[PDB]
Design a protein around this ligand. Structure first.
Ligand SMILES: Nc1ncnc2c1ncn2[C@@H]1O[C@H](COP(=O)(O)OP(=O)(O)O)[C@@H](O)[C@H]1O
Lengths: 457, 47, 143, 23, 602, 460
């Protein structure tokens, strides 16, 4: 039933501190209910109740507390949590951080209201994602393959072409209808236009929804921006059977809003001063993915994050690492050499590749090829590190073949055009024509049956 | 493997700064040794 | 108090348990009352079950040190009688001469750790094979 | 810093309560 | 007195409640009109603070808070096996059935066991009216599964004399199966007992551990063995393989039942288990059967409410102790004790308690200590004698991938086995990624008696394996400054057999049909051949380097390249296609081929 | 005499981790003990950590779970925590609170003693002098333990400090040219395999008739570990200073004790020292460790060998750090030596014994002992340096002398340190092995030994 009871409105602001405003005399505060604030000048803001205690409600104000006042500020308590109007009508539209429209279209008519927090998908109803998506990118489809409904982030150093990679996935991704949710947090306008323009250049724009929060929009709205995106993705996938892909852009600029809120609340700090709940907060984003029984929908997530000081062990990538189905890494050591897309296969993995490949999904050889490509690429890096100290005169002929493998591999397997789509089969054949650099017996990861069917060609 | 694993302390910061100066000094001494030998070697080649 | 992590009440309750079970086992293997060397080596426990005492009366007698009350000794003593009960149960259609039971009892009583013994392994193998055949359907394998 | 911040807040709470107890 | 108080305040997973005079600390309490489940963490007057095992968003001040007297507790009985439960014991299959939802609703109260199922009960026949009975006595079997006979037993707090015992027949969780009397007071029981998860289920004794916890992985079972009744940790960074070890133990081990505990884990893990385990099969007595019949999952996915991670871990061990008391050699996958410690960080943060290292509460080390030490091999309670065991394996997940982590630092002080995973091996896709330099097992001195009895050749091989694998790293620190030309022939042989033992013994692709599992006979056969090559190659050099006719590693490789290739090929032997005698015969032919080749070099 | 009846309160105004907050209390004492009776009638002891007017903060030993803010009947004793003591505590095992855990009765007191002890007047401390042969060369030769010394075994987690300590308990005795120790053992927070290992070893060695084990297992409540070492030391002072016994006190893991002070200190909101331990950790550890050594007019003497799990393998961690300031040296057990299969893994270099120089010389030992130890120690140190040089500058850059220090290092670990679990080597046999290793170098290289001592003992 609808909430029929008339809304209260309080002037009883009794403190303000950082992004918090503390009400008093509140009649039965509800934890996590939303409050609208009117400032003395008639400006409207919104905020969530973070704590309640007897008559007190601690409200965090999304649009910042600057201009909140202890006498004239009016808080309309809405009486419920942060619901969002959702509809399939949100495809082909663009929204601000808090889900207000910015494409000059009207306010969304709700086909329903959903709780922004979503719900924990029941582990019994969840279906283990296995139907492969070809992204078209050899460094993915060959060695890091993505299942329909996987969650797998793209990690990057700063300034790397990770935007162009995500754009290419949103230009080439498909199975062996489809729709995209896109969200960006703390993005610069010089990149917001790139994403919006790319969905026009790909012709895709009619099947995609962009939630944009820019670096000069309010930082606390970034907390809800990816949650709005996921709530829309749940409506499209689980209510409407759409094969949804969710792009979350700079989870780092989201994580910085967590660190800010944490410091402002005085929460117990984990590594680098992120809140203790950092893992759970990231899970509350990243777990809304994968198929569920009876529903043909399948939320896939490709978060993107700039790793601070390029450090893989930083809390943002590292906690994301524990949650996601493996990770795709983009590297300066490739990008400086103009090797687009600069995806370094070696540190990458996909947890679901194990079941997304082989007969009925991909050619029989694929799993064996992937492992042997890791083996040779890795040994190539090891002999390169040897050559950099002791010179090529210390290397055996086989060690020089592993060095040549790494060179030929990066120039052919990883190197691909920004608009070039390669099938998995073409990627595997490039894999084999590189593996043929060694004698058949040297391919120690591959069984003799696979070698007899696929090595000689 | 990647690191020395002296335990994080102002002691370790002192010792590692001294190790860095020691290692950079050792690089430069052995580089001077190499250059001196390299000059003699190039003279020997011409001779 | 506190032995093995049990409260006093639990410790004595386990003792009263071992007493009652030893008596059940003896009554099960020897309804004839003819395994007399075995029976004598349990008369100190069996008497409290042969008499119609209430549970808590045997408990209070154990707390008073009148009943046997070393739970480890009662466990070794119980195990010896139990493994003979397993032997007898595994061969019900063939129950051997009573002195062969008292002979095998002596061999168990002499053992430093009966629980580790091949005797217990042989009994486990018999129970596995037996319990399967009590339930398995007619087939060449099962016949 | 965090442990000392919490200690200082606990002291502020204890001071406030101690002044309320004058009534 | 009132049965309920009222919510005085809320902050994330913490709810304060007024009118709670006479509450007990760690009492289980319902919160809110929707009847959220929680537990009292602190008392502060006529007022209480409750950790809530569901998300509190939506709770209001002045909502009812209903006491229950009972501490956090689990229902134990028939119908546990094959099920999946959340951290507060709700059976997810029945939630799915009753709600038809994709998600677990807030406020669900579904009974922990399916009280409608008539189970087949077989009373012990040894019991009768008037017989004396004590906690841990098996009053009857229930034929729950074709594998696991459930052995119902008197609750550990209970004792008395049999007033009534039910005849052989079909009964459920509400049917009275047994009735006792003690001190003139009667006590009825159904087949379901209830136990406080924070209280250890007691035992007659905790014995030493002395039978290997057989595991599919070569490197684990050979070089760092776990033992039935022993603890273990698998600290590893993200993507290191610790979860696949945890799967592999559950899929393939000599554990009689497995409790798997998905504490704060990614949701697809539970789906993968529920996808794979009904389809994978063991065999008993000539009947092939689905391994799910020997498992249960406690799940609490990473996005489920933080507090329930604590209840999940305690549920997983309390279930494990229940099956231990039946005499099963239980194993229990604590699938991330760091994500558990992070839940203790959260409650501590809300309570404003003083943190130890990295924000963790000071009692973290004490909570972990009193958890892993619930393992053991035990003389069970009660009269029919059993030797059950719990073996606990904890997938610690160090923040930043660094073992200076406080969870690791505490865990290593408690566990008798360390399987430290290396991210650099996982990057190379070397798996399972066990670092053989830092890993250790304290159980070797106990297990050496089992190896002496069944595998007398093994202790020499295990020793030579560990030594070669250390000598590799001793050589590497030299080679990286001067180059490989510095090596003696003994050192080249050392690095080569280390490469065999690394790439063809320690490496194991556990999803493939051939690396799926590895019997001990296959494992020792592989290692025996590799070390036989080491000793023979070393002997050949030592025999001939006293002369100008010196054998070298290159001479051996050029004469014996096929033998190196055969040695590498040993991993591909498949237990489904090849019998133990067949694999052993192939390995004997490798020993003979090596001997005849070396006899031609010398 | 307690001629006045005990008060009792149902005024538990809060319960907070290990703390119970009483109110309306009349004239409480600091460090007084209470008997909490739970709703179910079960008893838990506690001790008052703070008082202020009507309020008293009780620490609860058996843990706080089940305590209730209305039903909990809390009985004050009127007095501080005095343990009973008697000689009948030898040949027995107790929990950390001092209750029996064998089948036997409660302790029938010959007296009651405050578990804090009382400060021994510095004037009355007779200085330690008799060396104990422990039977392990690495701590009989290059280091030694005086009877009355405080010298702990520092060890990282997973190391064989249990086997060291038990080997000392089997072997250890005075130098030969009734007398054996009563061993008081305290386990704090030990894993079951550790509990079993000591509990078995004392019985299997047959020496059990003269030892007393306090056990606290890891699954026993945290706060009991605070009492446990002080309780044991109070038994040690009774047996030694009142009954003339030579007592050996073994404390199994002072880290699981320090963690117990951390847990309660954190719950008290106390200002922390480093790593969040209470700032009073030093004085607290001192009231444990200083309770040792012979006293005026007694023959009796307490030797302490506390054992200490170095957290994260870090010697500079506050627990070993503060301990090193109080204890008269340390014995350091090293991961590096353990990984090399060197049992016991005693790294002789950071190992130190402040009293050792006074325990050695003619009539105490062979007269060479001091000189041999200093030379061997410096040789092992130079050995570790040239071992690093073998990588940094290469084996080919080592001189013949550096290669002799490398040979010394290898032979020394293989023969000097490596004992085996039962070899009770004499001090004399250890110095013979010392010379047999020193014999590797030319006589003139042995710069730490006087030429008289060399002429007597090098040509052997
Ligand atoms: N034993 C293995 N055999 C083959 N591949 C493995 C193995 N261990 C790890 N990998 C691959 O790496 C992935 C990451 O390891 P996993 O245990 O699943 O993640 P995590 O370390 O975070 O818990 C595995 O799911 C699998 O795809």
């Amino acid at each position: 039933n609808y909430l029929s009871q008339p809304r209260l409105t309080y002037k009883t602001v009794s403190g303000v501190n950082g992004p918090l405003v503390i009400l008093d005399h509140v009649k039965f505060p509800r934890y996590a209910e939303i409050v609208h604030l009117t400032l003395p000048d008639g400006t409207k803001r919104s905020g969530q109740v973070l704590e309640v205690s007897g008559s007190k409600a601690v409200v965090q104000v999304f649009e910042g507390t600057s201009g909140i006042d202890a006498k004239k500020t009016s808080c309309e308590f809405t009486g419920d949590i942060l619901r969002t109007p959702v509809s399939e009508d949100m495809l082909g539209r663009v929204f601000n951080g808090s889900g207000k429209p910015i494409d000059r279209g009207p306010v969304v008519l709700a086909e329903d209201f959903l709780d922004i927090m979503g719900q924990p998908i029941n582990p019994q109803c969840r279906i283990y994602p296995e139907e492969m998506i070809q992204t078209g990118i050899s460094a993915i489809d060959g060695m890091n393959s993505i299942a329909r409904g996987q969650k797998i982030p793209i990690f990057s150093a700063a300034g790397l072409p990770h935007n162009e990679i995500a754009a290419q996935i949103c230009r080439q991704a498909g199975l062996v209808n489809f729709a995209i949710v896109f969200a960006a947090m703390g993005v610069n306008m010089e990149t917001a236009r790139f994403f919006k323009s790319d969905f026009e250049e790909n012709g895709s724009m009619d099947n995609v929804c962009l939630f944009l929060n820019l670096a000069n929009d309010p930082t606390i709205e970034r907390i809800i921006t990816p949650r709005l995106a996921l709530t829309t993705a749940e409506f499209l996938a689980y209510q409407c059977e759409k094969h949804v892909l969710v792009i979350l852009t700079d989870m780092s600029s989201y994580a910085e809003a967590l660190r800010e809120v944490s410091a402002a609340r005085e929460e117990v700090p984990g590594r680098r001063g992120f809140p203790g709940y950092m893992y759970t907060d990231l899970a509350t984003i990243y777990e809304r993915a994968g198929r569920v029984e009876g529903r043909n929908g399948s939320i896939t997530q490709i978060p993107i994050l700039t790793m601070p000081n390029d450090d893989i062990t930083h809390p943002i990538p590292d906690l994301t690492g524990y949650i996601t189905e493996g990770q795709i890494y983009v590297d300066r050591q490739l990008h400086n050499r103009q090797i687009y897309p600069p995806i370094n296969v070696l540190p990458s993995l996909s947890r679901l590749m194990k079941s997304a490949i082989g007969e009925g999904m991909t050619r029989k050889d694929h799993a064996d090829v992937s492992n042997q490509l890791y083996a040779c690429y890795a040994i190539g890096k090891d002999v390169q590190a040897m050559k950099a100290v002791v010179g090529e005169e210390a290397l055996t002929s086989d060690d020089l073949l592993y060095l040549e493998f790494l060179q030929k591999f990066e120039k052919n397997f990883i190197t691909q055009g920004p608009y070039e789509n390669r099938t998995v089969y073409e990627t595997l054949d490039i894999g084999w024509q590189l593996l043929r650099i060694f004698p058949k017996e040297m391919l120690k990861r591959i069984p003799q049956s696979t070698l007899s069917e696929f090595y000689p060609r | 493997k990647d690191r020395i694993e002296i335990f994080p302390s102002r002691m370790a910061q002192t010792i590692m700064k001294a190790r860095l100066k020691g290692a950079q000094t050792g690089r430069n001494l052995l580089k001077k040794k190499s250059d001196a030998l390299t000059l003699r070697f190039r003279q020997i080649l011409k001779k | 108090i506190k032995m093995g992590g049990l409260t006093s009440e639990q410790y004595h309750s386990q003792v009263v348990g071992k007493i009652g079970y030893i008596a059940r086992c003896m009554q099960t293997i020897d309804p004839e009352n003819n395994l007399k060397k075995i029976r004598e080596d349990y008369q100190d426990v069996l008497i409290w079950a042969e008499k119609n005492y209430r549970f808590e009366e045997i408990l209070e007698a154990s707390k008073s040190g009148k009943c046997p009350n070393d739970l480890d000794a009662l466990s070794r003593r119980s195990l010896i009688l139990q493994e003979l009960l397993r032997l007898v149960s595994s061969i019900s259609p063939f129950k051997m001469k009573l002195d062969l039971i008292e002979s095998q009892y002596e061999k168990m009583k002499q053992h430093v750790n009966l629980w580790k013994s091949d005797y217990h392994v042989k009994l486990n193998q018999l129970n596995q094979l037996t319990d399967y055949l009590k339930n398995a359907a007619p087939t060449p394998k099962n016949n | 810093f965090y442990r000392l911040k919490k200690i200082q807040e606990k002291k502020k709470i204890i001071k406030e309560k101690s002044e309320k107890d004058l009534e | 007195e009132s049965t309920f108080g009222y919510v005085h305040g809320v902050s994330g997973p913490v709810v304060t409640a007024c009118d709670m005079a006479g509450a007990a600390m760690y009492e289980l309490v319902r919160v809110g009109h929707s009847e959220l489940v929680g537990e009292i963490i602190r008392l502060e007057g006529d007022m209480a603070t409750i950790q809530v095992y569901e998300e509190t968003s939506g709770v209001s001040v002045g909502d009812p808070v209903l006491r229950t007297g009972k501490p956090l507790s689990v229902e134990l009985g028939p119908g546990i096996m094959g099920a999946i439960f959340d951290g507060i014991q709700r059976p997810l299959s029945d939630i799915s059935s009753q709600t038809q939802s994709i998600y677990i609703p807030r406020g669900v109260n579904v009974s922990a066991l399916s009280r409608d199922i008539k189970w087949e009960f077989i009373p012990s026949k040894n019991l009768r009216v008037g017989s004396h009975i004590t906690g841990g006595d098996i009053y009857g079997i229930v034929n729950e599964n074709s594998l696991i006979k459930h052995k119902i037993m008197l609750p550990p707090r209970s004792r008395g004399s049999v007033t009534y015992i039910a005849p052989p027949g079909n009964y459920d969780a509400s049917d009275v199966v047994l009735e006792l009397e003690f001190e003139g007071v009667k006590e009825k029981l159904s087949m379901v007992q209830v136990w406080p998860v924070r209280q250890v289920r007691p035992v007659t004794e905790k014995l030493p551990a002395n039978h290997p916890l057989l595991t599919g992985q070569r490197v684990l079972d050979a070089l760092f063995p776990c033992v039935q009744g022993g603890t273990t940790a698998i600290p590893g960074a993200f993507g290191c393989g610790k979860t696949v070890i945890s799967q592999s133990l559950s899929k393939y081990s000599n554990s009689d039942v497995i409790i798997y505990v998905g504490c704060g884990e990614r949701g697809n893990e539970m789906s993968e288990v529920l996808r794979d385990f009904p389809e994978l099969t063991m065999e008993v007595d000539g009947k092939v059967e689905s391994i799910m019949k020997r498992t249960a999952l406690v799940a609490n996915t990473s996005n489920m409410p933080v507090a329930a991670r604590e209840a999940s871990i305690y549920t997983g061990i309390t279930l494990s102790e229940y099956f231990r008391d039946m005499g099963y050699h239980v194993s229990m996958m604590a699938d991330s004790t760091s994500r558990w410690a992070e839940a203790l960080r959260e409650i501590s943060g809300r309570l404003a308690e003083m943190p130890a290292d990295s924000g963790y509460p000071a009692y973290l080390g004490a909570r972990l200590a009193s958890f892993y030490e619930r393992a053991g091999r035990v003389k069970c309670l009660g009269n029919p004698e059993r030797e059950g065991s719990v073996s606990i394996v904890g997938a610690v997940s160090p923040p930043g991938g660094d073992f200076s982590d406080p969870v690791t630092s505490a865990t290593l002080g408690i566990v008798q086995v360390f399987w430290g995973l290396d991210k650099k091996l996982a990057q190379r896709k070397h798996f399972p990624s066990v670092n053989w330099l830092i890993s250790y097992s304290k159980y070797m001195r106990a297990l050496d008696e089992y190896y002496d009895k069944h595998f007398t050749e093994f202790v020499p091989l295990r020793t030579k394996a560990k030594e070669i694998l250390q000598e590799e790293e001793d050589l590497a620190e030299i080679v990286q400054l001067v180059g490989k030309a510095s090596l003696a022939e003994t050192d080249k042989i050392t690095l080569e057999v280390a490469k065999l033992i690394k790439d063809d013994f320690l490496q194991q692709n556990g999803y493939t049909p051939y690396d799926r599992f590895c019997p001990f006979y296959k494992t020792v056969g592989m290692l025996s051949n590799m070390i036989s090559f080491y000793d023979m190659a070393r002997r050949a050099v030592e025999t001939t380097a006293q002369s100008d006719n010196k054998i070298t590693w290159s001479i051996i490789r050029e004469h014996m390249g096929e033998i190196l290739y055969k040695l590498s090929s040993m991993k591909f032997k498949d237990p489904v296609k090849d019998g133990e005698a067949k694999i052993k015969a192939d390995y004997a032919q490798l020993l003979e081929d090596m001997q005849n080749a070396f006899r031609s070099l010398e």
